[PDB]
Structure 1
Amino acid sequence: VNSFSGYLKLTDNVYIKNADIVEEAKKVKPTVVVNAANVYLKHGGGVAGALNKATNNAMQVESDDYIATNGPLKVGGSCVLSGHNLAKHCLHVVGPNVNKGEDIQLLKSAYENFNQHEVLLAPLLSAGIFGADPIHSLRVCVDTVRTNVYLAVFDKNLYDKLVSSFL
């Protein structure tokens, strides 16, 4: 039993809800919230901008120190940093960016990072400003993640298309 409330169950391990991921995190304080990061951990917009703004820029300050020490992430890669006021940990995961020209096959590699955590709150990787089709992202998630993932989708209308088209 966990405190995630009101999610539709898609499979044995994948759940989905129309919700603000920042509000879900603020409400649930999960062990792990996933950020839709880029390789430079520059949290400008989308999920990343919203998460970082909710931490009062502390996520960005921590991230800049991480990059100064370690250099950029790989597309498809991840790092674990603090969850600040939102979660115990934030798993920063880099899905491929279609608006940058990155190969969508790396989306599976990106989702594999979730398997290192038993339970996660997460957005749909590579969707939104990263350019990929959210329906495809959901399919890759279901076919790749084996741990318990709670997907928060902010837009009610997008949330409806994903449910109604789910195989």
Structure 2
Amino acid sequence: SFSGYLKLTDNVYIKNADIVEEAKKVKPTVVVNAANVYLKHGGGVAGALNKATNNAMQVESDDYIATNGPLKVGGSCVLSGHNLAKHCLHVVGPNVNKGEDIQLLKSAYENFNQHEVLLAPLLSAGIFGADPIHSLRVCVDTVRTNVYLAVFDKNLYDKLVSSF
């Protein structure tokens, strides 16, 4: 199970960790990917998770898009977790750097409520351009299931904990 996490609330936990290394260690039931609507896992968390699967996540994702079309911003899909987890929940948070409505971040986090426990990054943080402090606030106020947040950056992790 999950180790070294700081408990923020009854159901939200946080750790300064690389989500790829965390996933390879825990092999959780669900790892969340910070996906885009096209499931093009180029950079950030998505690029890192996909690289850890030796591109198997991208091959599976391209077949999913060919069949279903793009996801909605705020939406998700469950695909294989490959060598990282049983499943990967690909969740699309709004990308502020594309002018997407930050109000969609709550809808994005609501996808986590369909899973009893998840290993996840902060949605819309990093290259998605949102304020990670705001993302953590929306996470705590939206997710009711057990979410283990992995924050890659130590300095951001310390800021998130100290300002919580």
Q: TM-score, normalised by structure 1?
A: 0.98
Question: 2:149 aligns to what SS in structure 1?
Answer: strand
Residue 118 of structure 2 corresponds to: 120
Question: 1:17 aligns to what SS in structure 2?
Answer: strand
Q: In the alignment, which of 30, 33, 37 is matched to residue 32 of structure 1?
A: 30
Question: 1:30 aligns to what SS in structure 2?
Answer: coil
Q: Distance in 2 between matches of 1:84 and 1:35?
A: 12
Question: 1:33 aligns to what SS in structure 2?
Answer: strand
Question: 1:151 aligns to what SS in structure 2?
Answer: strand
Query: CA offset at residue 156 of structure 1?
Result: 0.5
Q: Distance in 1 between matches of 2:89 and 2:39?
A: 11
Q: Distance in 2 between matches of 1:128 and 1:16?
A: 16
Query: CA offset at residue 9 of structure 1?
Result: 0.2
Residue 150 of structure 1 corresponds to: 148
Q: Distance in 1 between matches of 2:77 and 2:83?
A: 18
Count, aligned residues: 164
Query: CA offset at residue 94 of structure 1?
Result: 0.1
Question: 1:79 aligns to what SS in structure 2?
Answer: strand
Q: Distance in 1 between matches of 2:104 and 2:154?
A: 27
Q: Deviations over 1:46-69 (max 9, x none)?
A: 000000000000000000000000
Query: CA offset at residue 153 of structure 1?
Result: 0.4
Q: Deviations over 1:32-57 (max 9, x none)?
A: 00000000000000000000000000
Query: CA offset at residue 144 of structure 1?
Result: 0.1
Q: Deviations over 1:111-136 (max 9, x none)?
A: 00000000000000001000000000
Q: TM-score, normalised by structure 2?
A: 1.00
Query: CA offset at residue 103 of structure 1?
Result: 0.2
Question: 2:82 aligns to what SS in structure 1?
Answer: coil
Query: CA offset at residue 147 of structure 1?
Result: 0.1
Residue 77 of structure 1 corresponds to: 75
